[PDB]
């Protein structure tokens, strides 16, 4: 509360660390569905159905331009990619499988980096 703070966490490295994590997402073999925005002209339903489209390139641009105020806003965008993927794709599809794999991949790195 006013003049009562919990101990100051060192957040000075968060930007570098999220960048690193994103770089590792971008270079994963199953990242291909997520690298660029879904083309809303070419994928019927997507615009109407997916209210907040998100992809790795868009995240990279937001990250590099100071548009994440903190590491949690960054994790929210990453997860949004996978939540969108689940909304639009069958679990039993390459893309549905890619999304599950990448979420798992993300969450481990997230935990190892910031929890542990
Ligand atoms: C992420 C996603 O839903 C996605 C990703 C792709 C995609 N397809 C080919 C190459 C890259 N991404 C795609 C294609 C569709 N027809 C429908 C949905 N997607």
From Swiss-Prot:
Where expressed (tissue)?
Expressed at varying levels in several tissues, whereas a smaller transcript was expressed specifically in testis.
Which residue intervals define the domain Bromo in the entry? Answer: 9-113
Superkingdom of the source species: Eukaryota
Subcellular localization(s) per the UniProt record:
Nucleus
Indicate the secretion signal residues. Answer: none
The family annotation for this protein states:
Belongs to the WAL family.
As for what it does, the entry says:
Regulatory subunit of the ATP-dependent BRF-1 and BRF-5 ISWI chromatin remodeling complexes, which form ordered nucleosome arrays on chromatin and facilitate access to DNA during DNA-templated processes such as DNA replication, transcription, and repair. Both complexes regulate the spacing of nucleosomes along the chromatin and have the ability to slide mononucleosomes to the center of a DNA template. The BRF-1 ISWI chromatin remodeling complex has a lower ATP hydrolysis rate than the BRF-5 ISWI chromatin remodeling complex.
Q: How does it assemble?
A: Component of the BRF-1 ISWI chromatin remodeling complex, at least composed of SMARCA1 and BAZ2B, which regulates the spacing of histone octamers on the DNA template to facilitate access to DNA. Within the BRF-1 ISWI chromatin remodeling complex interacts with SMARCA1; the interaction is direct. Component of the BRF-5 ISWI chromatin remodeling complex, at least composed of SMARCA5/SNF2H and BAZ2B, which regulates the spacing of histone octamers on the DNA template to facilitate access to DNA.
This protein is called what? Bromodomain adjacent to zinc finger domain protein 2B
Species the sequence originates in: Homo sapiens
Q: What is the lineage of its organism?
A: Eukaryota, Metazoa, Chordata, Craniata, Vertebrata
Gene giving rise to this polypeptide: BAZ2B
